[PDB]
Design a protein around this ligand. Structure first.
Ligand code: JGX
Ligand code: JGX
Ligand code: NAG
Ligand code: NAG
Ligand code: NAG
Ligand code: NAG
Ligand code: NAG
Ligand code: NAG
Ligand code: NAG
Ligand code: NAG
Ligand code: C14
Ligand code: C14
Ligand code: C14
Ligand code: C14
Ligand code: C14
Ligand code: C14
Ligand code: C14
Ligand code: C14
Ligand code: C14
Ligand code: C14
Ligand code: C14
Ligand code: C14
Ligand code: C14
Ligand code: C14
Ligand code: C14
Ligand code: C14
Ligand code: C14
Ligand code: C14
Ligand code: C14
Ligand code: C14
Ligand code: C14
Ligand code: C14
Ligand code: C14
Ligand code: C14
Ligand code: C14
Ligand code: C14
Ligand code: CA
Ligand code: CA
Lengths: 757, 757
C-alpha cells in the first residue's frame, strides 16, 4: 500500500539495494549458523548499513533481509574507486558528408524511438568524482545522481569486503553461500513489464522497443541496454549485431555463384558422356559375394548434381571468403574503440591433469569413427531411392548420439578443472573455457574429416583386396562419388540441428521447470511483495554457452566453404531470430544480474584468429584431392588432340579380366544383366591386361600427383601474403576518435586550472 | 691559467654549457645576418641565459659564443619535464642460488674495475622533481646535483624553444644552421684522455677500461657509458654484446658437424665409384665447336670435396638453426625490460614517388645479372687449376662493382626522400631507413640467388639445344656440379669483404681528412683553449650505418646455412674486433653528441622478424632442389636389389648417339682421347637410343619430382609450428622484475603520505 509493495522500507524513504534470504526452519549446527549470521549482521552494521528482517510470509521456513546504504557511504565508496561523472562543461563537436546525410535520410524509418537516438551536437565533460572537489559536479539532486545499478554495485563491493571474526580466512558472501548458511542474494527489478495501469520504467520500454518479434528489422538501443544491465552484457549484443551485419554482402555472391552453375549444366561434356546410352560400359561389383555387375548410365542424376558444386566459380568464391574474414576482424577491432571511448572506459597436479586431458582428447577422437561406422551399419541393416534414404537415416542416427555425448564431455571438463586447485577466479574461467572448447571441437568436427579425406582411398585393386582382421573388407565410396554425401551431411546438420531442435529446446526447457514447481508447490488475491515475486524467477547462469554456440557456428562457414556455396545464407536466417530470442530471456525470465566492468570480449579473439588461420590449409587440400579439377586440367593440356574435353571418361577407366578373381570373391550370379560378361571396368591408373606388366602403376599416376602437390604450395603462400597485406594497410584506430581526445585534453588543462578555481 | 683553459668564464665561477660559432669575416646580406643573430641573442637574453663573445683567435674569421644557465632556470626546466631523481628513502632488496654464487666466484677476473660493479643490496627511491615539494630531495650541493649531460640537454631544449621575431615561422637553431647564419654548435668534453699530469675524469677511465685492444675478454661498464654519452648510444652496445654472446654455443655444433664429415669421407660409395679408373665413361662436350669429350675420373677431387657439405648432419643443423633465432628474439625481449627498469624509463607526390621507387627497385634487380655475366665473361677471356682461378677472379671482379654501386644507390635514396615533403622529423628517418635497406638488400643478395636456383637448368638436350637471339647458347654448370661455386662465393665474401677491407677503410678514412686539413692549413707552444681544441674534431653522423652493417651481416648466417656449416664461426671473429673498434671512435675521434631518451631500438625489430620468417622457405628449397639427398633416398627404397648404395652413378646417366649431332655442333677433333667415340653419356632422365621413343622423358622423371615437392610441404609446416611453440611457452616479462615494482608501489603509498608530511 504505502510501501509501494516492498520497494521502500516501512517508513517509505529508504530504498532496498540488496536482499539476502536464509532458511530459518521453524540442532547444534543450526545454532552455529545462526551465531555466524548474527556476527555477519553485526559486522555489516559496523560497516554502516541499515538492517531489517521479515518473517511473516506464505512460503514456509524463509526469511528475508533488507540492505540500505546512506549518502556518505556512497560518496566515500565512489571516491575510493575511479568513477567518472558528467560535468557542467559543454563543448561543440569538432562530398563525403552529403552521402552520410542521404543515408541518414533514407535510414530514418528503421531507427528505434528512444531519447538517446536524437542527434546531439554538444557533449559534456567527465572527471573523476572525489570529496575534495565537489564544486565541479552539480549536487542538486541526491536521488537522480546515482543509478540503481551503480547503487547496487557499491553494496556488493561492501559485502565482498566484509569478513567474519570466527572464520578469519573466510571473506565475503561467496564463502557463506558456498557453506550453506545462506540461500541466495539478488538485487530487485524496477517493476512490471505488462499491464494497462503500469507506470513508465526502463523494463517496459525495453520490452516494447527491443525484445519483440515484430520489430526484427530495426536497430538496437545499445545505450539503454548498457544503462539497465551493464557493460558485459552490451558487448555480447554489439558483437552479435556486428557479426550479423557482415553476412548480407556475402549471402548474395554465393547465390549468384550457385545460380551460375544451373544455367550451364546442359552443355557439360563430362556429364553428357556418362548419361549417354549408346555405349555399353559394364563395371565391376562393389562388394563381396552379394553385389553384382552394374552399368554407368545408372548414375546420371548424381553426375548432373555434382556439377553444381565444383567449377571455377567455386574457386573464386574460396579466394573471396579468404579475405572476407580478414576484413571482418579489422572492422570489429576498429568498432570496439568507439564503444570504449563513449562509455568512459579509456605443480605435479598440474602436469598430471594435463596428461590426463591429452589422454581423454585422444580417446574422444578415437570413439567418433566407431560411432559413425556403427550408425552406418545399423542404417544399412534396418532397410534390408535406397542410397539417399540410407545416408539420411545414418546421419539422423549419429546426430542423437553426438547430442548425448556433449553433456558427458562438459561434465568431465568441469570435474577435471575442479580437481586442480585454481589460483584465482579469472584463471578458473579461462581454463574451463579452453577445456570445454577443445572437447566440443573434437566432438563436432570428427565425422566430417573422415568422409572428406579417408573414406574409400586405401582399398586395393580387383584381385588383390585389403582385409582387416583377415575377415572384414574395407568399404568403398558411393557409385557416383564421395562428394555427394558431404553435401547431404552439411545441409542436414546446418538446417536441422542448429535451427530447429536447438531453438525449440531453448524455448521449452523453462516450461518443464515451471510445471514441476507448480506440481510440487500444491488462489492469490492479495498483491505479493517484490521479493516474493522475484523469488520465483530463474537465476542467471553466465555468458559462456552463448559465445560457444556462435563460435562453433563460425567454423562451418569458413572451413568447409570450398564445396558448399550456400553456407553463409543458412546462418543469416538463424542470426535474425537469435537476437530477439535471446532478448526476451533477460527481460522476462531470468533474475537481474549485477554489473561488471569490461573493456574487451576476452579470450574468444584468439580462438577466432586461430580458426581463421587454420581454414586455409583445409581449403587448399579440399580443392586439390577431393574434386576433379586437377585431372581435367592435366587432360586438357597434355593428352587431347582437339584441345577440347572429348574422351575424358574414356581416359579415367581401367580394365580387368573377370577370370582372375580370387577364390570366394566372384559374384553368385553373373547373368542378371542378361548377357555374358568377360571384361569389367574400374576407376584407377594401372596397366592393361594385354601387357607385359599387368595391373601395375603407370606413368600417368605420377604426372597427376605432382600437379596436385604444386597447387597447395602456390595457393597457401599466395593466400597468406594477401591476408597479411590487408592487415598491414588498414590502420587500427579511427582518425576522428583520436583527434577528439587532444582537444578535450587541451580544455582539460583549463579544467585542472578550474580545480583550484 | 686561472680559467682552466676555457672551461669556466673569466670570473671563474660560470661553467660553459654550449658553444655557438659564427663566420665573422673581417655586404647587405652580411648585415642582415648580423641583425638576425643580434635579435636571436636578444631573445636568448630575454630567456635568461648569460652571453659572452671572443674574437681574438689564431684562426681567421671565426667568433665563439658562450652560453651559461642559472639555478632557477634549471629548476624550472627540470620541473617542466618528467625528470626522476634519487631520494633518501632506502629499502633492502627483496640450490639455484648456489649455482649463481659459484659462477660469480668463477667470473671474478673478467669483470671490469669500476665502482658501480660492486654489489649493492640496497637501492634508493626515485620521485619526480618539482618546486612544490623540495623537502623529499636533498639539495645539499648544487654543483653535484646535475650532471653535465642533463645540464646541456636543458640548454638545448631552451635553444629549440627560441623563435625569431623577423622570421615568425622559423623556430629553433636548426633553421638558423640550415640557412647559413651559423656554422656549428656542440657541447664540450670533460678533458684529456692521455697524459701523465692529467687529473681523473670519465674520459680517461673509459679509455683505459673500455676502449682498448688489450681488454677484449672483459665485460662492458654499460652504466658509465650511459652516464657519459646517453641512453641511445648504450642500447646499441648492449644489443651488440647480447648478439655476440649467443654465437659461442652455435659456433661449436657447426665445428662438430664439419668434423663429422671428414672422418667418413673414405667410406663413401658414390664418391668411390666416380674415382675408380676401371671403367671407361666418356662424357659429351660442354660447349659448341671448341670443347671436346672428357672423362669422369677428372672430377674426383670435386666429388670428394662435395661430400663435406651435404649429409644428414647438415639437415639436423638446419633444424637447429631454425630454433636458435627464435630463442635469441625472446632473450633480447626479456633483456630489454631490465634495462628499462634500471634506467628509470618505466598525396599525388607520395604515389608518384612510390611508383618511381618500384621502378628503380626493378631496374636494380635487373642490372645485377648483367654485371655478373659480364664479369664471368671477362674473367674467362683474361686467362685465355684453371676453373678455381677463373671463379675466384670473377668473384673478385664483381665485388668491386658492387662496392661502387652501393654509394650511388644510397644517394638516389636520399634524393628520393628529399623530393617528397616530410611531415615531421621521425617519419623522415623512418622512411629513409626503409628506402636504403631495400636497395642494399637487393644489391647484396642478387648474385647468390642466381647461381643457386637458375644457372644450368633450362639448357635443352644433346641434339636440341636452346639459343637466345638465335646466336648465343646458354651456359652450363661446372663439371662436378654447381654446389662448389656457392661455397667459394660465400667464403670469399665473408672472409674478405666484411672483415679486411671494411675495417681497413674504417680505420684509414679519417687519416686522409687529417692530412688534407694539415696541407690546407699551412709551431704551437701556448696552450690552446677548449673550444679551439674541440673545433678540430670530426662531427657525429648517426647510428644508421652501424645498425645497417650488422643487420646485413645477420642475413648471411640464417638464409644460407643449409650448405655452409662454418658461417657462425666467421661472424664471431669479426664481432670480437668490432666492439673495441667502435669504442675508440667515440672517445678519441668524434665530437660529443647530445643526449636523447629512448626506450627501444626501434624499427629494426620488424626487419629482424621478417628475415627470420623468410629464411625457412629458402632453406627448404635449397635442401630440396640443390642437393642429391632426395634422389639417393628414392634410389635406395625403390630401385636397389641389395638394399645398399651400389649402382647409383649407373642409374643417373643417359646415352646419346654421336651421329645425330646438329650441323655446326660437333667437336672439331674427336681423336684427342686416343680412341674412336661412338656413344657419349650425359646426366638426365630420358629414353635410350635403342627404343621406340628416343630421348623422351621417362617414368622416373615424374617419380622424383613428387618426392621433391612433398618435402617442402612437410618441412615448412613442421618448422613453423615448432617456431610458434617456443614463443608460446616462454613468458615475456621476468618474474622478479615485476615482483619488485609492487613492493616499491606499496612503499610509495607511504611516500605519497610523506609528500604532505
Ligand atoms: C584420389 C586420390 O588418389 C590417390 C592418392 C593417394 C593414394 C591413392 C589414391 O587413389 C585412390 C585409390 N582409389 C581407387 C583409384 C578407386 C577405385 C574405384 C573403383 C574400384 O573398383 C571397385 C576400385 S578397386 N578397389 O577395385 O581398386 C578402386
Ligand atoms: C635438377 C632439377 O631438375 C629439374 C627440375 C625442373 C626442370 C628441369 C630439371 O632438370 C634440370 C636439367 N638439367 C639437366 C638434367 C642436366 C644436364 C647435364 C649435362 C648435359 O650435357 C652437357 C645436359 S644437356 N644440355 O646436354 O641436356 C644436361
Ligand atoms: C548393350 O546393352 C543393351 C541394354 O539393354 C542390351 O540390350 C544390348 O544387348 C547390349 N549389347 C551388347 C553388344 O552388349
Ligand atoms: C573433336 O574430335 C572429334 C573426333 O576426333 C571430331 O569429330 C571433332 O570435330 C573434334 N572437334 C573439334 C572442335 O576439333
Ligand atoms: C576407351 O579408350 C580405349 C583406349 O584407346 C578405346 O579403344 C575405346 O574405344 C574407348 N571407348 C570409347 C567408348 O570410345
Ligand atoms: C583373360 O581374358 C582373355 C580374353 O580377353 C582370355 O583369353 C584369357 O584366358 C584370360 N586370362 C586367363 C588367365 O584366363
Ligand atoms: C680405356 O681407357 C684407357 C685410358 O687410357 C685406355 O688406355 C684404354 O684403351 C680404354 N679402353 C677402351 C676399351 O676404351
Ligand atoms: C651388392 O650387390 C653385389 C652385386 O649384385 C654383390 O656382389 C654384393 O654382395 C651385394 N652386397 C650385399 C651387402 O648384399
Ligand atoms: C650402367 O647401366 C646399364 C644399364 O643396365 C648397364 O648395362 C651397365 O653395365 C652399367 N654400367 C656399369 C659400369 O655397371
Ligand atoms: C646410332 O648408333 C648405332 C650404333 O650404336 C648406329 O648403328 C646407328 O646408325 C646410329 N644412328 C644413326 C641414325 O646413324
Ligand atoms: C505483428 C507481427 C507481424 C510479423 C510477424 C513476424 C514473425 C517472425 C517472422 C520472422 C521472419 C524472418 C525471416 C526468416
Ligand atoms: C543490426 C540488426 C540487423 C538485423 C537484420 C535485419 C534484417 C536483414 C535482412 C536482409 C535480407 C537480405 C537477403 C539476401
Ligand atoms: C535426370 C536428371 C535429374 C537432374 C536433377 C537436378 C536437381 C536440381 C535441383 C535444384 C533444387 C534447387 C532448390 C533451391
Ligand atoms: C577477390 C579476389 C578474387 C580472385 C579470384 C582468383 C581465382 C581465379 C580462378 C580462375 C580459374 C580458371 C580455371 C580455368
Ligand atoms: C560499414 C562498413 C564496414 C566495413 C565494410 C568492409 C567491406 C564489406 C564488403 C566485403 C568485402 C570483401 C572483399 C573480399
Ligand atoms: C574496416 C573498414 C573496411 C573498409 C573497406 C576495406 C576493403 C578492403 C581493402 C583492402 C583490399 C586488399 C586487396 C588485396
Ligand atoms: C585410416 C583409418 C584411421 C583414420 C583416422 C582419422 C579419422 C579422422 C580424424 C579427424 C581428426 C580431426 C578431428 C577434429
Ligand atoms: C592414416 C594413414 C593410414 C595408412 C594405411 C596404409 C594402408 C596400405 C594399404 C593400401 C595401399 C594401396 C591403396 C590403394
Ligand atoms: C525421392 C527422393 C527424395 C530425396 C530426399 C533427400 C532429402 C535431403 C534433405 C536435405 C535437407 C534437410 C533439411 C531438414
Ligand atoms: C505475434 C507473432 C508471434 C511469432 C512467434 C514466433 C515463434 C518462433 C519460435 C522459434 C522457432 C524455431 C524453429 C523455427
Ligand atoms: C587440433 C586443433 C584444435 C583447434 C585449433 C585452432 C584453435 C586455436 C585456439 C587458440 C587458443 C588460445 C588460448 C589462449
Ligand atoms: C593463437 C592464434 C594462432 C593459432 C594458430 C594455430 C594453427 C595451427 C595449425 C597447425 C598446422 C601445422 C601442423 C603440423
Ligand atoms: C592463388 C589461387 C589461384 C591460382 C590458380 C592457378 C591455376 C590457374 C589455371 C591454370 C593455368 C592456366 C594457364 C592458361
Ligand atoms: C698488450 C696487448 C696484448 C694482446 C694484444 C691483442 C691484440 C688483438 C688480438 C685479438 C685477437 C682476437 C681473436 C681473433
Ligand atoms: C660481452 C663481451 C664478450 C666479448 C667476447 C669474449 C671472447 C669470447 C671468446 C670465445 C671463444 C670460443 C671459441 C669457439
Ligand atoms: C685427390 C683427393 C683430394 C681431396 C681433397 C680434400 C680437401 C680437404 C681440405 C680440408 C681443409 C680444412 C681446413 C680447415
Ligand atoms: C634441435 C632439433 C633437431 C631435430 C633434428 C631432426 C632432423 C633429423 C634428420 C634425419 C635424417 C635421416 C636421413 C636418413
Ligand atoms: C644467459 C642465457 C640466455 C638464454 C639461453 C638460451 C639457450 C642457449 C642455447 C641455444 C639453444 C638452441 C636450441 C635449438
Ligand atoms: C630467454 C631464456 C631462454 C631459456 C632457455 C630456453 C630454451 C628453449 C626452450 C623451448 C624448447 C622448445 C622445443 C620444441
Ligand atoms: C632465367 C633468367 C632470368 C633470371 C631472373 C632471376 C635472377 C635472380 C633473381 C633474384 C631475386 C632476389 C634478389 C634479391
Ligand atoms: C624464370 C622462368 C623462366 C622459364 C624459361 C622457360 C624456358 C623453356 C626452355 C627450356 C625447357 C627445357 C629445359 C631442359
Ligand atoms: C692449387 C689450388 C689453389 C686453390 C685456391 C683456392 C682459393 C680459395 C680461397 C677461399 C678463401 C679466401 C679468403 C680470402
Ligand atoms: C698493442 C696491440 C695493438 C694491436 C693493433 C691491432 C690493429 C687491428 C686493426 C684492424 C685490422 C682489420 C683487418 C684484420
Ligand atoms: C623482396 C624481399 C625484401 C625483404 C623482405 C624481408 C624484410 C622485411 C622488412 C619489414 C619492414 C617493416 C617496416 C615497418
Ligand atoms: C613485418 C614482419 C613480417 C614480414 C614477413 C615478410 C615475409 C614475406 C614472404 C613472402 C612469401 C610469399 C611470396 C608470394
Ligand atoms: C621436419 C624436417 C625433417 C623431416 C625428415 C623427413 C625424411 C626422413 C627420412 C625419410 C623416411 C625414412 C623412414 C625410415
Ligand atoms: Ca540457439
Ligand atoms: Ca666494419
Amino acid at each position: 500500500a504505502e510501501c509501494k509493495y516492498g520497494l521502500y522500507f516501512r517508513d517509505g524513504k529508504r530504498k532496498v539495494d540488496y536482499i539476502l534470504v536464509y532458511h530459518h526452519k521453524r540442532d547444534y549446527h543450526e545454532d552455529d549458523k545462526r551465531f555466524r549470521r548474527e556476527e555477519y549482521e553485526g559486522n555489516l552494521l559496523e560497516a554502516g548499513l541499515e538492517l531489517e528482517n521479515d518473517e511473516d510470509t506464505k512460503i514456509h521456513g524463509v526469511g528475508f533481509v533488507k540492505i540500505h546504504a546512506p549518502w556518505h557511504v556512497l560518496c566515500r565508496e565512489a571516491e575510493f574507486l575511479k568513477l567518472k561523472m558528467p560535468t557542467k562543461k559543454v563543448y561543440h563537436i569538432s562530398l563525403l558528408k552529403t552521402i552520410n546525410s542521404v543515408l541518414q535520410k533514407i535510414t530514418d524509418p528503421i531507427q528505434p524511438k528512444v531519447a538517446e537516438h536524437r542527434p546531439q551536437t554538444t557533449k559534456r565533460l567527465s572527471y573523476p568524482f572525489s570529496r575534495e572537489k565537489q564544486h565541479l559536479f552539480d549536487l542538486t539532486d541526491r536521488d537522480s545522481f546515482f543509478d540503481s545499478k551503480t547503487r547496487s554495485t557499491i553494496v556488493y563491493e561492501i559485502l565482498k569486503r566484509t569478513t567474519c571474526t570466527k572464520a578469519k580466512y573466510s571473506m565475503g558472501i561467496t564463502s557463506l553461500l558456498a557453506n550453506g548458511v545462506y540461500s541466495a542474494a539478488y538485487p530487485l527489478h524496477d517493476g512490471d513489464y505488462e499491464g494497462d495501469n503500469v507506470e513508465f520504467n526502463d523494463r517496459k520500454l525495453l520490452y516494447e522497443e527491443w525484445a519483440s518479434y515484430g520489430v526484427f528489422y530495426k536497430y538496437q538501443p545499445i545505450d539503454l541496454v548498457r544503462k539497465y544491465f551493464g557493460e558485459k552484457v552490451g558487448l555480447y549484443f554489439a558483437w552479435l549485431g556486428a557479426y550479423t551485419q557482415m553476412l548480407i554482402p556475402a549471402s548474395i555472391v554465393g547465390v549468384i555463384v550457385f545460380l551460375y552453375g544451373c544455367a550451364t549444366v546442359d552443355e557439360n561434356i563430362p556429364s553428357m558422356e556418362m548419361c549417354d546410352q549408346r555405349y555399353n560400359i559394364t563395371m565391376c561389383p562393389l562388394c563381396d559375394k552379394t553385389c553384382s555387375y552394374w552399368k554407368m548410365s545408372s548414375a546420371c542424376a548424381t553426375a548432373r548434381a555434382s556439377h553444381l558444386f565444383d567449377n571455377p566459380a567455386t574457386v573464386f568464391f574460396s579466394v573471396f571468403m579468404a579475405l572476407w574474414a580478414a576484413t571482418f576482424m579489422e572492422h570489429w577491432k576498429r568498432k570496439q574503440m568507439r564503444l570504449n571511448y563513449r562509455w568512459d572506459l579509456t605443480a605435479y597436479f598440474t602436469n598430471l591433469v594435463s596428461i590426463i586431458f591429452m589422454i581423454a582428447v585422444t580417446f574422444a577422437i578415437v570413439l567418433g569413427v566407431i560411432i559413425y561406422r556403427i550408425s552406418t551399419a545399423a542404417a544399412l541393416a534396418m532397410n534390408s531411392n535406397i542410397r539417399v534414404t540410407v545416408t539420411a537415416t545414418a546421419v539422423i542416427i549419429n546426430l542423437v548420439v553426438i547430442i548425448l555425448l556433449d553433456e558427458v564431455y562438459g561434465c568431465i571438463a568441469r570435474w577435471l578443472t575442479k580437481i586442480e586447485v585454481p589460483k584465482t577466479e579469472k584463471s578458473f574461467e579461462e581454463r574451463l573455457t579452453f577445456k570445454a572448447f577443445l572437447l566440443k571441437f573434437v566432438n563436432s568436427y570428427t565425422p566430417i574429416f573422415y568422409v572428406a579425406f579417408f573414406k574409400g582411398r586405401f582399398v586395393g585393386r580387383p584381385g588383390d583386396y585389403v582385409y582387416i582382421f583377415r575377415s572384414f573388407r574395407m568399404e568403398e565410396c558411393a557409385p557416383g562419388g564421395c562428394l555427394m554425401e558431404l553435401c547431404i551431411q552439411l545441409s542436414i546438420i546446418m538446417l536441422g540441428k542448429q535451427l530447429i531442435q536447438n531453438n525449440l529446446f531453448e524455448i521449452g526447457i523453462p516450461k518443464m521447470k515451471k510445471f514441476i514447481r507448480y506440481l510440487k508447490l500444491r488462489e492469490y488475491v492479495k498483491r505479493k511483495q517484490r521479493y516474493e515475486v522475484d523469488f520465483n524467477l530463474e537465476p542467471f547462469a553466465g555468458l559462456t554457452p552463448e559465445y560457444m554456440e556462435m563460435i562453433i557456428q563460425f567454423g562451418f562457414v569458413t572451413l568447409f566453404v570450398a564445396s558448399f556455396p550456400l553456407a553463409p545464407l543458412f546462418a543469416l536466417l538463424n542470426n535474425i531470430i537469435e537476437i530477439r530470442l535471446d532478448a526476451k530471456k533477460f527481460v522476462t525470465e531470468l533474475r537481474r544480474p549485477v554489473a561488471i566492468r569490461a573493456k574487451d570480449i576476452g579470450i574468444w579473439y584468439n580462438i577466432l584468429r586461430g580458426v581463421g588461420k587454420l581454414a586455409v590449409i583445409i581449403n587448399a587440400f579440399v580443392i586439390s584431392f577431393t574434386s576433379d579439377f586437377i585431372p581435367r586440367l592435366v587432360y586438357l593440356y597434355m593428352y587431347s588432340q582437339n584441345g577440347t574435353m572429348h574422351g575424358f571418361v574414356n581416359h579415367t577407366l581401367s580394365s580387368f579380366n573377370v577370370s582372375d578373381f580370387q577364390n570366394g570373391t566372384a559374384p553368385n550370379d553373373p547373368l542378371d544383366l542378361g548377357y555374358e560378361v568377360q571384361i569389367c571396368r574400374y576407376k584407377d591408373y594401372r596397366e592393361p591386361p594385354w601387357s607385359e606388366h599387368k595391373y601395375d602403376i603407370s606413368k600417368d599416376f605420377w604426372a597427376v600427383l605432382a600437379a596436385r602437390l604444386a597447387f597447395v604450395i602456390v595457393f597457401q603462400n599466395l593466400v597468406m601474403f594477401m591476408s597479411d597485406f590487408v592487415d598491414w594497410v588498414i590502420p587500427d584506430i579511427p582518425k576522428d576518435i583520436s583527434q577528439q581526445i587532444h582537444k578535450e585534453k587541451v580544455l582539460m588543462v583549463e579544467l585542472f586550472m578550474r580545480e583550484e578555481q
